[PDB]
Symmetry: C3
């Protein structure tokens, strides 16, 4: 297992940490949502939660990433939920497919 | 009407407040986006805004929730904007279909 | 080029800055994702990043906006990544098609 801290940013001002697919995978529209492995695991830094979002270059090439919420205390593997929009999409091993954004986790009095 | 404060978190580290559908609804791909009732109303806590996002277990079962922005001062009913991706999806009353994330509302000098 | 500061909010409590299309464009489902011009450019205020999200009235009319991350130091044109869901969608010049949300950019020790 590899932690969040192993992820990298494209540039200092890049909002997201890049997430790569660990397998070669082919996706077609009729397959619907698929969960792609990353080999990267939660949990997140205290007081933060994560959002998985698409990279625009990948979205424009026809692979939609469904935004996903990563809970602060999640300790499982971060998977990318993805669907081919219109056409056959081929993802190669180590391709940068999504990005992880970290956001503040607001406290509320909501019952847990 | 029920306020945000009545919503619940799965767990202390869960980023989202769960949103349930108040009706039994069937969705097919050809129907396009549908607004599902929740019986839950704005407004939000001061200096925050909301984002409606899908639950991953639901996304992977073929129901896409379109991310929605809930404005701080919205006082209407929070509805879930949803679409069946590929197949017929059946939502039962009280099923947890989406989640509400609260985020800080940044001030800017943009004209209003 | 026009900066972010020229954008406007619907109302004081509106989380988003409105983004309008600079061209008349027709979209059909088979076309897949399209990048719509806005004539608005980065960069963003220090310590913030942007998220492009759909307006709910537009989503419910059948035009999906793919959430997009705007990096702090992006200096290019902000484009709206959009797809007609089920039907033919016609976007007119100056129509409000998306919104820009500003969020805090969290610092991490991730290698850049
Ligand atoms: O795209 C995603 C979304 C979620 N996740 C993981 C991280 C998060 O902590 C966990 C829970 O996600 P959701 O709350 O959105 N799913 P759900 O509500 O269906 O499951 P649970 O009831 O356990 O919260 O699933 C992913 O790995 N990828
Ligand atoms: O998924 C959603 C998205 C928005 N909303 C509500 C809450 C928000 O305050 C209100 C406005 O949403 P948008 O700003 O995204 N819609 P639009 O720009 O089309 O309407 P308005 O011009 O009034 O802001 O709609 C939902 O109930 N569900
Ligand atoms: O919907 C979008 C998404 C991104 N963008 C721009 C702003 C952002 O700074 C830039 C990078 O977006 P992504 O990081 O999501 N794309 P990608 O990872 O494919 O490119 P890069 O490797 O340069 O980061 O693209 C848009 O204009 N519209
Ligand atoms: Mg990127
Ligand atoms: Mg959940
Ligand atoms: Mg709006």
């Amino acid at each position: 297992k590899q932690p969040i801290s192993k992820l990298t940013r494209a540039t200092p001002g890049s909002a997201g940490l890049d997430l790569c697919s660990t397998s070669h995978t082919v996706l077609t529209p009729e397959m619907g949502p698929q969960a792609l492995s990353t080999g990267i695991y939660g949990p997140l830094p205290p007081n933060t939660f994560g959002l998985i979002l698409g990279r625009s270059s990948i979205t424009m090439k026809g692979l939609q990433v469904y935004p996903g919420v990563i809970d602060n205390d999640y300790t499982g593997e971060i998977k990318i939920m993805a669907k081919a929009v219109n056409n056959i999409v081929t993802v190669s091993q180590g391709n940068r497919i999504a990005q992880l954004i970290l956001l503040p986790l607001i406290e509320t009095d909501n019952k847990v």
